[PDB]
């Protein structure tokens, strides 16, 4: 059970946005809390990562990129979880102090990606998604986005990824289920893409609509996010 012993142990506890649920919902109110939460969650995604099984294999640059590349898609996924486990997919549980409704979904001008994300959370329930299945699916996602130029140490990565999936074969132990899980893992990317698009654009227009970006998130959005959007850095899909 070791591999799960790990993931359970290292699983970061849910973090808050510090958002003001007394103040009215507005676009700028909402989107200065999701950039702060993103940075907060990222800080938990770094810790989490470093302690993963065999992740200190990799060239420190590949360690770093892969996180910046897979950061959005992960966050969604544990929101996929958090929304499902806490609110039964009626609402989005980005955090305890920033659970999203339809009004917020619209005020945030993120409505589409947001339906998509509830649908995900719905598919968490539809499909009997267990927590161990959740941890190794979430673990997997870290290794779900590469330069098609490949990595500096691409061989370690190829093999590392092979094992995290082997771990996901065993959590099921049959092939019927895999297809769906995979299929789901695959349903993360289009979203993380759409968001990445919105984020990007939002950064670009940030000075004009009164929305606050953390000195660090702007880097990732301006330097690493765009490699994804230009097609230099692709998702690894299971299907099609």
């Amino acid at each position: 059970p070791i591999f799960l012993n790990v993931l359970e142990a290292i699983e970061p506890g849910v973090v808050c946005a510090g958002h003001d649920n007394n103040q009215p919902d507005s676009f700028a109110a909402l989107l200065s809390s999701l950039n702060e939460l993103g940075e907060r969650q990222l800080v938990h995604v770094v810790k989490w990562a470093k302690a993963l099984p065999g992740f200190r294999n990799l060239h420190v640059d590949d360690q770093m990129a892969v996180i910046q590349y897979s950061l959005m898609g992960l966050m969604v996924f544990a929101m996929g979880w958090r929304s499902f486990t806490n609110v039964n997919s009626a609402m989005l549980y980005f955090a305890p102090d920033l659970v999203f409704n339809e009004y917020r979904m619209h005020k945030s001008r993120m409505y589409s990606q947001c339906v998509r994300m509830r649908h995900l959370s719905q598919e968490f329930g539809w499909l009997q998604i267990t927590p161990q299945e959740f941890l190794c699916m979430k673990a997997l996602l870290l290794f779900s986005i590469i330069p098609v130029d490949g990595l500096k140490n691409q061989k370690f990565f190829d093999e590392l990824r092979m094992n995290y999936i082997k771990e996901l074969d065993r959590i099921i132990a049959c092939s019927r289920r895999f297809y769906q899980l995979t299929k789901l893992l695959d349903s993360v990317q289009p979203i993380a893409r759409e968001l990445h698009q919105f984020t990007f654009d939002l950064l670009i227009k940030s000075h004009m609509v009164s929305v606050d970006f953390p000195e660090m998130m702007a880097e990732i959005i301006s330097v690493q996010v765009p490699k994804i959007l230009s097609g230099k850095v692709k998702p690894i899909y299971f299907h099609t």
Binding site: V46, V60, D61, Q63, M64, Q68, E215, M216, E219, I220
Partner: peptide, 8 residues
């Protein structure tokens, strides 16, 4: 160099 590589 970069802020994300610094923190790491």
């Amino acid at each position: 160099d970069s802020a994300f590589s610094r923190y790491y």
